[PDB]
Structures are given as structure tokens and as C-alpha cells.
Coordinates of C-alpha atoms and ligand atoms in Angstrom, one line a residue:
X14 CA 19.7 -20.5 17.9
X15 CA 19.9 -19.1 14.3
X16 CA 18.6 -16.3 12.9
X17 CA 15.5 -16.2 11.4
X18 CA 13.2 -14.2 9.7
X19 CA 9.6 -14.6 8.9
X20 CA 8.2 -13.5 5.7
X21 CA 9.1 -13.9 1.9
X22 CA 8.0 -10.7 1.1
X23 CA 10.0 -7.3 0.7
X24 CA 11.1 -6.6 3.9
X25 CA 12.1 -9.9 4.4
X26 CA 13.9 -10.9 1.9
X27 CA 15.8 -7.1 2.3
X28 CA 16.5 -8.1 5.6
X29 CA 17.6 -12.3 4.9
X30 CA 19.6 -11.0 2.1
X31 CA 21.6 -8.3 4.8
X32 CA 22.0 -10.6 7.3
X33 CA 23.7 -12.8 4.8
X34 CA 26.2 -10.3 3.5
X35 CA 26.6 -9.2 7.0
X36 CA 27.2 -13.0 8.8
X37 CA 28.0 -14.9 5.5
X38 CA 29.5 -18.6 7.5
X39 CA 26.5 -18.3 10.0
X40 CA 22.9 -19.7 8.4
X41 CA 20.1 -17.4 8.2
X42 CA 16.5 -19.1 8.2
X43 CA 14.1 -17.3 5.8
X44 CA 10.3 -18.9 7.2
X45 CA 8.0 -18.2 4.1
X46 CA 4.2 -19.3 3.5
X47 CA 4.1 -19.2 -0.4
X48 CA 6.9 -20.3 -2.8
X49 CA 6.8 -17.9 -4.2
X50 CA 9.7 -14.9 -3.2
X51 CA 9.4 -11.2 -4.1
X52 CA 12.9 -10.0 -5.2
X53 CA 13.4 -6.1 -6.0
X54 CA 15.0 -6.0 -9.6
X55 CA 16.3 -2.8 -11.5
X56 CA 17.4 -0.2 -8.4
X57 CA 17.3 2.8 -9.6
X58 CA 18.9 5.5 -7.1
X59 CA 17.6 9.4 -8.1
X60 CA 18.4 11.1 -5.2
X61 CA 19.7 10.7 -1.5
X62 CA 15.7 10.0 -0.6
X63 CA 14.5 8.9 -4.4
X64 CA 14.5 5.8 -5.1
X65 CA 12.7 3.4 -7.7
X66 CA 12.8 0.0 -8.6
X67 CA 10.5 -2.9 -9.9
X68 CA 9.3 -6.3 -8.4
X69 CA 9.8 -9.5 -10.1
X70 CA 9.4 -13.0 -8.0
X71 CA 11.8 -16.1 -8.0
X72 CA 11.9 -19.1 -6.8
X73 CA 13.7 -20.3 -3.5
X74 CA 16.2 -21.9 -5.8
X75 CA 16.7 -18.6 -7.3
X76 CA 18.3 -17.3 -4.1
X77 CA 20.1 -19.7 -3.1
X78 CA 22.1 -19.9 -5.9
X79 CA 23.2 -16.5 -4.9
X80 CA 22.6 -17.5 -1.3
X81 CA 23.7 -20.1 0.1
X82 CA 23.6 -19.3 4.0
X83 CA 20.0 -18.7 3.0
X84 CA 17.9 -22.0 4.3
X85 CA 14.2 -21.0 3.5
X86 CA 11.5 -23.1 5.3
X87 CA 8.2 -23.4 3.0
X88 CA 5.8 -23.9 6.5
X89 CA 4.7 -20.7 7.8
X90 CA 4.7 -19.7 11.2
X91 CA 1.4 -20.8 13.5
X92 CA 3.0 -20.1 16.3
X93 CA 5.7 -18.1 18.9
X94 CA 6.8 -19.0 22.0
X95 CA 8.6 -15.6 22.9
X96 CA 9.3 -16.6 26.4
X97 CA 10.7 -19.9 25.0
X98 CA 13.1 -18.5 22.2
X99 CA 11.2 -20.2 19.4
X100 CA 8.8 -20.4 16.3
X101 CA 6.7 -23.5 15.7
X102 CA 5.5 -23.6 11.9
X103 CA 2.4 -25.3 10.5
X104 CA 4.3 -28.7 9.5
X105 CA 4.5 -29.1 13.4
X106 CA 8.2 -28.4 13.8
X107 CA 9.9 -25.9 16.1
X108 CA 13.1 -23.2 15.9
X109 CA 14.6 -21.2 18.0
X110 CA 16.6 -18.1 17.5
X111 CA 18.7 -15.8 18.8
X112 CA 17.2 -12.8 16.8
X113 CA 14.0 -12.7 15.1
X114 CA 12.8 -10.2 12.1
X115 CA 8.9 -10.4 11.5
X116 CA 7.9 -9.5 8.6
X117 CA 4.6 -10.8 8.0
X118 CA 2.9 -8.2 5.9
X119 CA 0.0 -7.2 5.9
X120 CA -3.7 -9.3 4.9
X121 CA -6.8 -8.6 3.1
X122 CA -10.4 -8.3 4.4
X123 CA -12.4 -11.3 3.2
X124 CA -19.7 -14.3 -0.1
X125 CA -20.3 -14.1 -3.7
X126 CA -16.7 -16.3 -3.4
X127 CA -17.4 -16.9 -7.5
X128 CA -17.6 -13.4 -8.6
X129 CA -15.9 -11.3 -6.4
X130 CA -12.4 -10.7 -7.6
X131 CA -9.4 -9.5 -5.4
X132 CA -6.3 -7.6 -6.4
X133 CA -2.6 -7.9 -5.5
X134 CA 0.2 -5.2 -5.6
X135 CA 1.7 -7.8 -8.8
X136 CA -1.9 -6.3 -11.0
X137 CA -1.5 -4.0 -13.7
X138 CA -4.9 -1.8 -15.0
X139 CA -4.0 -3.4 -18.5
X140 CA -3.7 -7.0 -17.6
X141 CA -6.1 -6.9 -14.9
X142 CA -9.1 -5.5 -17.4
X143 CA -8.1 -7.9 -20.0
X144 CA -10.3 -11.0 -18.1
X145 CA -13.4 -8.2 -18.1
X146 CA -13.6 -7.6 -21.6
X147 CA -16.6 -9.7 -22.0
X148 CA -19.1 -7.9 -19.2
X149 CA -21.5 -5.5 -19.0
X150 CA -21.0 -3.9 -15.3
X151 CA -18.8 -4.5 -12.8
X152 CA -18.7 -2.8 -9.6
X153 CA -15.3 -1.7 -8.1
X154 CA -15.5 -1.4 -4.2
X155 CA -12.6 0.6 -2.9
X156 CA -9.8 2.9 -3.7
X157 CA -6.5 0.4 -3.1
X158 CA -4.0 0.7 -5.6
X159 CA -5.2 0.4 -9.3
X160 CA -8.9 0.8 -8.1
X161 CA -8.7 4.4 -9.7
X162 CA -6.7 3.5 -12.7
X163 CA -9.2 0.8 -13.7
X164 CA -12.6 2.8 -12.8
X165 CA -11.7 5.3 -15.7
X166 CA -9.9 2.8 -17.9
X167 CA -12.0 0.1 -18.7
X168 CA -14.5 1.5 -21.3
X169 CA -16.7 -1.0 -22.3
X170 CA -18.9 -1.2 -19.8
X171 CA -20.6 0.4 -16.8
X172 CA -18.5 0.7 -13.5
X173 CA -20.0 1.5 -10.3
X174 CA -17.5 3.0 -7.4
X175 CA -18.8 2.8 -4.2
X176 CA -16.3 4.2 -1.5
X177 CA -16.1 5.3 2.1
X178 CA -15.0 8.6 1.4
X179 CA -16.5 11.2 0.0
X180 CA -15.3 12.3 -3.1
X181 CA -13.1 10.6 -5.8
X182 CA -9.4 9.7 -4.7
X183 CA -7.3 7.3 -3.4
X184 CA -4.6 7.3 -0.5
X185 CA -2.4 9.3 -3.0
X186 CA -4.6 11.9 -4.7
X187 CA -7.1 13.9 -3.2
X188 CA -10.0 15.2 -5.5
X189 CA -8.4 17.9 -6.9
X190 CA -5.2 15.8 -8.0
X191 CA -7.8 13.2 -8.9
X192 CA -9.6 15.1 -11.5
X193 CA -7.0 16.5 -13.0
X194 CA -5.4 13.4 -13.5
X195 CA -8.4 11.8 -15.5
X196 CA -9.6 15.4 -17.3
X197 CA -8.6 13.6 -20.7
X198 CA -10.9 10.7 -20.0
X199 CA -17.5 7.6 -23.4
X200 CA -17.1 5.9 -19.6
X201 CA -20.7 5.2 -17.9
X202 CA -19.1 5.5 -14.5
X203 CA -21.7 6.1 -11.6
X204 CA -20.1 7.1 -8.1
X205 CA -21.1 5.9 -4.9
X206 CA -20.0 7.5 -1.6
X207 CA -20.2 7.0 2.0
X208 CA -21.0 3.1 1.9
X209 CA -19.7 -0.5 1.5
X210 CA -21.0 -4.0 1.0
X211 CA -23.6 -4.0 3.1
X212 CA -24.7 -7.7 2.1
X213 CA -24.2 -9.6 -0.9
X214 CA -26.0 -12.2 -2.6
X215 CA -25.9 -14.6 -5.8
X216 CA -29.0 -14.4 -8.1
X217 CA -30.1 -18.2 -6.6
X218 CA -30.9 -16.3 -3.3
X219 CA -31.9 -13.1 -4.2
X220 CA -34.7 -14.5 -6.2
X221 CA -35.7 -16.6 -3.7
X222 CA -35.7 -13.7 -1.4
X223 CA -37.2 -11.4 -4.6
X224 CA -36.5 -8.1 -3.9
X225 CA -35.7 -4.8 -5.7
X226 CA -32.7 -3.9 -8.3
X227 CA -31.7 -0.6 -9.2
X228 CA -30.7 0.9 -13.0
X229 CA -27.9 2.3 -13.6
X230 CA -28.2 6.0 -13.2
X231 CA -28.9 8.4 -16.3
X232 CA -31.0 11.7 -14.9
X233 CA -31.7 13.1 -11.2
X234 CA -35.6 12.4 -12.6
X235 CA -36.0 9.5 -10.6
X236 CA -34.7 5.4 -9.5
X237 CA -36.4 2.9 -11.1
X238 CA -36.1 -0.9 -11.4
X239 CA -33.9 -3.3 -13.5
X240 CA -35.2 -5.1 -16.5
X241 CA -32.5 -8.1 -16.8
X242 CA -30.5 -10.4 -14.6
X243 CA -27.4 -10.5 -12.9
X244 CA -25.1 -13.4 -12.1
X245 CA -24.8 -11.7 -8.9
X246 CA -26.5 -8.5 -6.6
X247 CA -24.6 -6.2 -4.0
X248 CA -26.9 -4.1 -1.4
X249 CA -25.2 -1.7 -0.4
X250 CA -25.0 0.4 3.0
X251 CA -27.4 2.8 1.9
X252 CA -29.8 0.2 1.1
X253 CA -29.2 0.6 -2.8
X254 CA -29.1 -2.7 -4.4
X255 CA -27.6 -3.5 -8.3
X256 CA -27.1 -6.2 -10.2
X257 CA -23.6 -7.1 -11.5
X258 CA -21.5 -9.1 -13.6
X259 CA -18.2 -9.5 -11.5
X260 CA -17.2 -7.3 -8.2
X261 CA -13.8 -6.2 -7.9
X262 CA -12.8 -5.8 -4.3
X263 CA -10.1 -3.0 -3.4
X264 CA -11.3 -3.1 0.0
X265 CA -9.0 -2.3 3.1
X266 CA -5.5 -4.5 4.6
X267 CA -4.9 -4.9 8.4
X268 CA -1.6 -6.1 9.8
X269 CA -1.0 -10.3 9.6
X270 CA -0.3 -10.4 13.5
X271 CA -2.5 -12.8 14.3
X272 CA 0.1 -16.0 14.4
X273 CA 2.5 -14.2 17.0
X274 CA 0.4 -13.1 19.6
X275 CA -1.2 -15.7 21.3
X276 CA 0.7 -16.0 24.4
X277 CA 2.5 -13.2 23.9
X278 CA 2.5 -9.0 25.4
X279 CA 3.6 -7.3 22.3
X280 CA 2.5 -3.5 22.2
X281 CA 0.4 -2.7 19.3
X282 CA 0.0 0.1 17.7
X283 CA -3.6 2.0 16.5
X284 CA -3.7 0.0 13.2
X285 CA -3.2 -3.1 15.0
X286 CA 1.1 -3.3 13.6
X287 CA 3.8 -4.4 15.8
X288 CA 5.2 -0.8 17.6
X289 CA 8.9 -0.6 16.9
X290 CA 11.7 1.7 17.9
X291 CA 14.2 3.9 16.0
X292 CA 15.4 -0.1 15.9
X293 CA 12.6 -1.7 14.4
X294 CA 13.2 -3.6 17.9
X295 CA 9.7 -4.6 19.1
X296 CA 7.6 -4.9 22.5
X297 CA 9.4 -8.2 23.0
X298 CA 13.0 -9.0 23.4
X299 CA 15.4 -9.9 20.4
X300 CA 12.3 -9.3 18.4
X301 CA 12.5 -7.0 15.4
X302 CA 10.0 -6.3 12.8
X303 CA 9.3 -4.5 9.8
X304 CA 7.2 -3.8 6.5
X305 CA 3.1 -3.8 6.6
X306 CA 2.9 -5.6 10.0
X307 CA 4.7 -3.1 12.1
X308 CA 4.6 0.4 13.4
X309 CA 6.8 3.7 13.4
X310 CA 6.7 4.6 17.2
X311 CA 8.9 7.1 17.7
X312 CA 8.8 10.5 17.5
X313 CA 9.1 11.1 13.7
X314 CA 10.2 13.5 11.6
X315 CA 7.4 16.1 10.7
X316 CA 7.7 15.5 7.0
X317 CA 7.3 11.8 6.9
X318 CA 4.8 8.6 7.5
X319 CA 4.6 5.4 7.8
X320 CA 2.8 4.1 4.6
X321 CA 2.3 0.6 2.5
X322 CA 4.8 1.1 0.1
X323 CA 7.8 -1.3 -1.8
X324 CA 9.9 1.4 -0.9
X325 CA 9.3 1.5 2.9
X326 CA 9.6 -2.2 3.3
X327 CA 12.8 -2.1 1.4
X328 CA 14.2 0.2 3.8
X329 CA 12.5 -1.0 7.0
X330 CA 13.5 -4.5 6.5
X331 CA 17.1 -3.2 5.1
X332 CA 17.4 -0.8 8.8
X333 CA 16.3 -3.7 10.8
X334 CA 18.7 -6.3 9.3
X335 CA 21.7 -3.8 9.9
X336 CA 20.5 -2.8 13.5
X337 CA 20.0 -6.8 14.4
X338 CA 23.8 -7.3 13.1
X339 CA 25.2 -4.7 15.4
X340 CA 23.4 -5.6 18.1
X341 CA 25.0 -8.9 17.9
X342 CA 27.9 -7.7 17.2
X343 CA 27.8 -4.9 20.2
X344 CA 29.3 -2.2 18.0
X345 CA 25.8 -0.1 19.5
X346 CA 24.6 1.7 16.4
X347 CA 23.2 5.3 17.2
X348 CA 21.7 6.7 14.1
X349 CA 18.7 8.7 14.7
X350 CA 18.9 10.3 11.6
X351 CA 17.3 7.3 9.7
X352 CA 14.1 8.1 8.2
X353 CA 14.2 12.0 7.3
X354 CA 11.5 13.0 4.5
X355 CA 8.6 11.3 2.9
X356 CA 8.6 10.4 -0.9
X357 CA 6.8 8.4 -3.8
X358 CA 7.6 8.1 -7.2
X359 CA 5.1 6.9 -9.6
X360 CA 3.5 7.1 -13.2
X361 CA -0.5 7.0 -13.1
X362 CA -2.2 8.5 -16.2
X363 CA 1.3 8.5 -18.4
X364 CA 2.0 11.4 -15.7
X365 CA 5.3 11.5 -13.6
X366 CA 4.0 11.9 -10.3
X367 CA 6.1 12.8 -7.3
X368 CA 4.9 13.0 -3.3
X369 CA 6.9 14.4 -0.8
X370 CA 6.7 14.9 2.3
X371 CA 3.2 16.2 4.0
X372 CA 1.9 16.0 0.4
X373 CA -1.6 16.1 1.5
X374 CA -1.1 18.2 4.7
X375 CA -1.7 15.0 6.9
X376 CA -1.8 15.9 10.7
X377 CA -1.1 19.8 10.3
X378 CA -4.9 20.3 10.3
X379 CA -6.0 23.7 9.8
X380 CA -3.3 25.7 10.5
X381 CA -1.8 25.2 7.3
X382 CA -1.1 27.6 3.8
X383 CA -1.7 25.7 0.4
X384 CA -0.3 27.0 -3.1
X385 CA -1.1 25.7 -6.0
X386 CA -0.3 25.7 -10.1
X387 CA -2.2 23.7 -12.5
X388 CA -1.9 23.6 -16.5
X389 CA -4.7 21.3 -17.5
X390 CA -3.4 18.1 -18.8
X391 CA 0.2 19.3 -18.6
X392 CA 1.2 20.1 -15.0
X393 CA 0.2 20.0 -11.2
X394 CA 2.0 21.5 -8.8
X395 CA 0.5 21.6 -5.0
X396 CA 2.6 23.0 -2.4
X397 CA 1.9 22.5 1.4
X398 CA 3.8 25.3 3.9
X399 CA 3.4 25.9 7.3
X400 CA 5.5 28.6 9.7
X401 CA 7.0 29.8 6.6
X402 CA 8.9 26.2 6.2
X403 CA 7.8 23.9 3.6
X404 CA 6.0 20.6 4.8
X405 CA 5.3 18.7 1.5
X406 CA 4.6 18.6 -2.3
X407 CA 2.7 17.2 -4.8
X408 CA 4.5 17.2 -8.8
X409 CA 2.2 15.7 -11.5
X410 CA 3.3 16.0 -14.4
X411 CA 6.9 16.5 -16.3
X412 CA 7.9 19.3 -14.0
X413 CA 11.7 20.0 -12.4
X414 CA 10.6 21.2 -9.0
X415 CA 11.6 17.8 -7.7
X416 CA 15.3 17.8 -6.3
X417 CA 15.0 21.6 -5.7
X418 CA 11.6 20.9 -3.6
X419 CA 13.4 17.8 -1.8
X420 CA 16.6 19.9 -0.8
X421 CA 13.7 22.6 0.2
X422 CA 11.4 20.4 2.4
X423 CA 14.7 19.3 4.1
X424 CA 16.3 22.3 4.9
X425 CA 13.0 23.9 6.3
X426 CA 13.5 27.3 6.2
X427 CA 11.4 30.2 7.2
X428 CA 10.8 30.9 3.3
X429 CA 8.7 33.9 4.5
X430 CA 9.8 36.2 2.0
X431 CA 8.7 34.3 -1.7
X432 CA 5.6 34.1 -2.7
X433 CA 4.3 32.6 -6.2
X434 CA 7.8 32.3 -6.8
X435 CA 7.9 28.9 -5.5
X436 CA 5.9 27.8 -7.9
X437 CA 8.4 28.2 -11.5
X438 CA 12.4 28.0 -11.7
Ligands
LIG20 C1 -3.7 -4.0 -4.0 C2 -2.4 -3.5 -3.5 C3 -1.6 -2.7 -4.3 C4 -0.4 -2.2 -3.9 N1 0.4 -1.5 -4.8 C5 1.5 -1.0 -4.4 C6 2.3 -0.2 -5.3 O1 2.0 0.0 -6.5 N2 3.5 0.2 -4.8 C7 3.9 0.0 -3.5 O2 5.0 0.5 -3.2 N3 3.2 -0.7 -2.6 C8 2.0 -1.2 -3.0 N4 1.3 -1.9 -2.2 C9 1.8 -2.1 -0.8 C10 2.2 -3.6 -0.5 O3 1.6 -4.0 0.7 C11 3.7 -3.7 -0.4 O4 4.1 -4.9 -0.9 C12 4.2 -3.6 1.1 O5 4.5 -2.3 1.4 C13 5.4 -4.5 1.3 O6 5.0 -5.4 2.4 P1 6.1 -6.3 3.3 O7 7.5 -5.8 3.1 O8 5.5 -6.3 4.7 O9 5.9 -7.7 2.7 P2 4.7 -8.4 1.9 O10 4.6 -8.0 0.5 O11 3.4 -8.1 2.8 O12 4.9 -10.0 2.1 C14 4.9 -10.6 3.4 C15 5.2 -12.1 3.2 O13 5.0 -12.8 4.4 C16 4.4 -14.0 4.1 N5 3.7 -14.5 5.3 C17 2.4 -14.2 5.7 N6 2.1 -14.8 6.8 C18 3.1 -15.6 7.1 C19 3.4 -16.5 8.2 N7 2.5 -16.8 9.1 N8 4.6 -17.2 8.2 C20 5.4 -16.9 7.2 N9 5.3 -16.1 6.2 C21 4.2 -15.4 6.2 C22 3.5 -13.7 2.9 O14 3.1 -14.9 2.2 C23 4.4 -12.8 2.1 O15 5.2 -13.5 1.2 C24 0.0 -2.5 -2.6 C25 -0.8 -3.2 -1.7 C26 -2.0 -3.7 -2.2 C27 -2.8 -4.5 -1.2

């Protein structure tokens, strides 16, 4: 059997790419569903832990030219036969392998079909609100991704926000972060909290059904009625009902493991991903995985987490391809060392924003000291301790705390003895 590897995405194509610098006269099988293949363009390394880098997409063509052990088969997988050494793909053919790499990602939750809109991690606020230029509300469900960017961009018309949480914030800001990263943003933006889409319906139904529509908010006086029509009408979990010109959906992503576990025993994790090892080795044998669809199971480092992130696929698919060579190879691999602090690199608001480690003092509940130094619409700088050691950061903003803060969170310390001075070089 060959090796294959399952998924055109970023940790596959990491870990295709690997495996064909590491076994160049032996064929690597890339199994994709889409022609389309993410490629990572413009590395940029910062630091021993920061990295950046963009995502363009090519062709298959595109890497074969610069791969040609490389076979990609455009049929993706319906079906594995673990026991059996094999994949069997929707054009009805089979392959077996001696090592597999899933890497499956990770799909959406999916009713108003016409006007509900999805987003993709290949949307920009920019280009995405250019198509909504000609609406007069749109209601934004969610907090994935450019959810927050786009609730306070687009000014031309009314957005409505309604979330699960309870304040303002997405997986990366909490509200704090959050309002000061939009203090310079008129907007009528109306928040709704603690709810999602109930039921939806066009306006063919609902006036059929002829019920009630809610305004758009102005005083705490009172709710009253709408006056004109909507293409389509959203009631809510708290039984509030609105009209609406187009829904965009930033709604929640669960692990694509659905094809590989019919008659299967793989060992899932909480979130429903694959459990892996230090080895990204699964439940199964000579099964690896890596990217969205799997999960960190072992005992990790107390400054980092699992998250959905180009970076973490990179290097999960680029680990597992490495640990799947020596395997083969016997030389027995024993790094334990691999994934050592959490960090994120990003620009929101035109602001350089930096996450490391426990940023937002996930898991340490409680027992926990928080510092903080804010400059408003110049700098944010959160700092999350705990025993004296430093367990993660939050740099919005042009600051320099960053390599000093990495080197810091690393070391861990018992940094007992400065106070405020963490805070400025
Ligand atoms: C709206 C949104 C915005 C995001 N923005 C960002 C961002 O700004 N930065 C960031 O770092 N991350 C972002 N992410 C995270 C995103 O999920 C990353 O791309 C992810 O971390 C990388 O996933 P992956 O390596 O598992 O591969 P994926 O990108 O998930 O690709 C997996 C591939 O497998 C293919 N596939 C699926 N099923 C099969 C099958 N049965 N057989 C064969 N192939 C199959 C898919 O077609 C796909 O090509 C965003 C996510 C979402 C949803």
C-alpha cells in the first residue's frame, strides 16, 4: 500500500508535501474533495514560536509541477475499512495504505437557503460587505472569524448580532479587548445575547402564518411592530422575531468525521475530533491525523491549546508527516518537546495584535492575578499570572512586549518580586 493522505486543506497538503521531500521515488496519494488546494505562500518566521504567513489556492496541476510523487485523487473519501487497510472514495474505487494522515477538517452547521449567507476562512470584511451594499438590515448570527469585523464595519445599514454569549467578543477578544478595539467606531448596531435561530422563515410563509415583527430598537420606552416587509424573517430563541434583508451565518464548525467511522472504534475526543498522541497517531493503527478534525490528547503544556488556526494545522500536519516517516523508517522519534507555548498573530482594527499563551486565562479559573495597561486607541496590554509565573498575554496595539513576553511565558519564573513593572520596557 501507498501512502495517503486525506484532505486538500492545510494540514494536508503540509503533510503530502513532507512526505514527498521525505520519500521522494515512493508516490504519495493526496485524496481531496474540491479542486481546489490551499497552499501556504509568503512564510514569514518572527520568532522560534511566531510565525505568519498567507493562504493562496492552486490548482492540482500547480503541485505537481513541483510534485511529482504527488498523485492527488479528486473523489473524496465515503468510506474506511481500517481493519481492511483501505479507503473507498465516492467514484466507487478502493486504496489501501500502509500509513494514513486524515485531515479532514472541520464542517459547518447547516432554511432561508436564498438568503442566508455563509462565510469561509478565504472572506475578507472589505470584500465580503461589498455584495451588501445595497440592503437595509442584515442580521449577523455568530462570532466566527470576521463576524466582529463586519458587525462594526459595514455602515450603511442596520446590523443585528445575536450570540450565545453574553457580551460582545469572539473566540479571540473578550469584552474588554473588544471595546477597545472598536472605541473609534453612525452604526445602528443592536445586540442580541443569549439566543440563536430559533426558526426561520421566508416572507411567503410567514404571511401565511401572519404573525408579529419587531423594529429595530431606538429607546428602552417600549417594542412595537414593523411597518414594511422583509424578503425574509428570523424568530429567534427568545421568541423576538425581525425582518431582514440577507442573514449572514457565523454560526459554529464540528469535526468532518463522519466518513471514517462507520465500522470503525476510533476514540473521540469532547468536541467530537480524532484523539491523537504526542504522534498525532490515532485510536487506530497506522492512522494519523491532524488539523480541525483531530484532538491534542496528551498532557499539554500549561500555556497552550488546541485551536482552529492556519498555524496549528500547518504544524500538526507538518509533526504528523515527520512522525509517519520515522515510523517507517524505525529511527523512533522521541520529541516530547513539540508543542511548547500558545501564539497568534493578527491585524483586526489596523491594530497588531498578539496572543500568547493563556491569553484569556482559559482553564486556570479563579485562582488567577490579571494586570492590565490600556491607552485608548493606542495600546492594550493584558497580562495573565498565576504562582508568580506568567501564563499568557494579550498585545494590541504597536507595543514591544512581544519577544520579551514570549521568552517570559517560557521560562516561567516565580516573577514574585515586579509588579507594574511588567507592564513598560
Ligand atoms: C469562517 C472561518 C474563518 C476562519 N478564519 C481563520 C483565520 O483568519 N485564521 C486562521 O488561522 N484560521 C482561521 N479559520 C480556521 C480554519 O478552519 C483553518 O483553515 C483550519 O485551522 C485549518 O484546517 P485543516 O488543516 O484541518 O484543513 P481544512 O482547511 O479544514 O481543509 C480540509 C480539506 O479536506 C477536504 N475534505 C473534506 N472532507 C473530505 C473527504 N471526505 N475526503 C477528502 N477530502 C475531504 C476539504 O474539502 C478541505 O479541502 C477560520 C475558520 C472559519 C470557519
Amino acid at each position: 500500500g501507498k501512502f495517503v493522505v486525506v484532505g486538500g486543506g492545510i494540514a494536508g497538503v503540509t503533510c503530502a508535501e513532507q512526505l514527498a521531500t521525505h520519500f521522494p521515488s515512493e508516490d504519495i496519494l493526496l485524496v481531496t474533495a474540491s479542486p481546489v488546494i490551499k497552499a501556504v505562500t509568503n512564510f514569514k518566521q518572527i520568532s522560534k514560536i511566531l510565525e505568519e504567513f498567507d493562504v493562496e489556492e492552486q490548482s492540482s496541476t500547480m503541485l505537481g509541477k513541483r510534485f511529482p510523487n504527488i498523485k492527488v485523487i479528486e473523489s473524496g473519501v465515503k468510506q474506511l475499512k481500517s481493519e481492511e487497510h483501505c479507503i473507498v472514495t465516492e467514484d466507487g474505487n478502493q486504496h489501501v495504505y500502509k500509513k494514513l494522515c486524515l485531515c479532514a477538517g472541520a464542517k459547518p452547521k447547516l432554511e432561508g437557503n436564498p438568503y442566508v449567507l455563509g462565510i469561509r476562512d478565504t472572506d475578507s470584511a472589505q470584500e465580503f460587505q461589498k455584495q451588501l451594499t445595497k440592503a437595509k438590515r442584515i442580521m449577523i448570527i455568530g462570532n466566527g472569524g470576521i463576524a466582529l469585523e463586519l458587525v462594526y464595519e459595514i455602515e450603511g445599514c442596520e446590523v443585528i448580532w445575536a450570540i450565545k454569549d453574553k457580551a460582545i467578543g469572539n473566540t479571540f477578544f473578550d469584552a474588554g479587548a473588544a471595546e477597545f478595539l472598536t472605541s473609534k467606531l453612525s452604526h445602528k448596531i443592536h445586540l442580541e445575547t443569549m439566543c440563536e435561530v430559533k426558526k426561520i422563515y421566508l416572507q411567503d410563509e410567514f404571511r401565511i402564518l401572519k404573525k408579529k415583527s419587531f423594529t429595530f430598537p431606538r429607546d428602552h420606552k417600549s417594542v412595537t411592530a414593523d411597518t414594511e416587509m422583509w424578503p425574509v424573517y428570523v424568530e429567534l430563541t427568545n421568541e423576538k422575531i425581525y425582518g431582514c434583508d440577507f442573514i449572514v451565518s457565523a454560526t459554529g464548525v464540528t469535526p468532518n468525521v463522519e466518513p471514517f467511522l462507520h465500522g470503525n472504534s476510533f476514540d473521540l475526543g469532547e468536541d467530537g475530533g480524532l484523539k491523537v498522541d504526542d504522534h498525532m497517531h490515532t485510536s487506530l493503527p497506522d492512522i494519523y491525523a491532524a488539523g480541525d478534525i483531530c484532538t491534542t490528547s496528551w498532557q499539554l503544556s500549561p500555556v497552550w491549546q488546541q485551536m482552529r488556526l492556519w498555524t496549528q494545522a500547518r504544524q500538526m500536519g507538518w509533526y504528523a508527516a515527520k512522525c509517519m516517516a520515522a515510523a517507517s523508517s524505525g529511527d523512533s522519534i522521541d520529541m516530547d518537546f513539540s508543542f511548547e507555548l500558545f501564539a497568534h498573530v493578527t491585524k483586526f482594527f489596523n491594530y497588531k495584535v498578539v496572543l500568547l499563551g493563556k491569553y484569556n486565562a482559559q482553564g486556570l479559573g479563579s485562582d488567577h492575578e490579571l494586570m492590565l495597561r490600556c491607552t485608548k486607541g493606542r495600546e492594550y496590554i493584558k497580562v495573565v499570572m498565576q504562582n508568580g509565573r506568567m501564563m499568557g498575554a494579550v498585545l494590541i496595539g504597536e507595543t514591544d512586549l512581544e519577544e520579551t513576553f514570549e521568552n517570559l511565558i517560557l521560562n516561567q519564573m516565580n516573577l514574585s518580586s515586579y509588579g507594574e513593572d511588567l507592564l513598560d520596557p
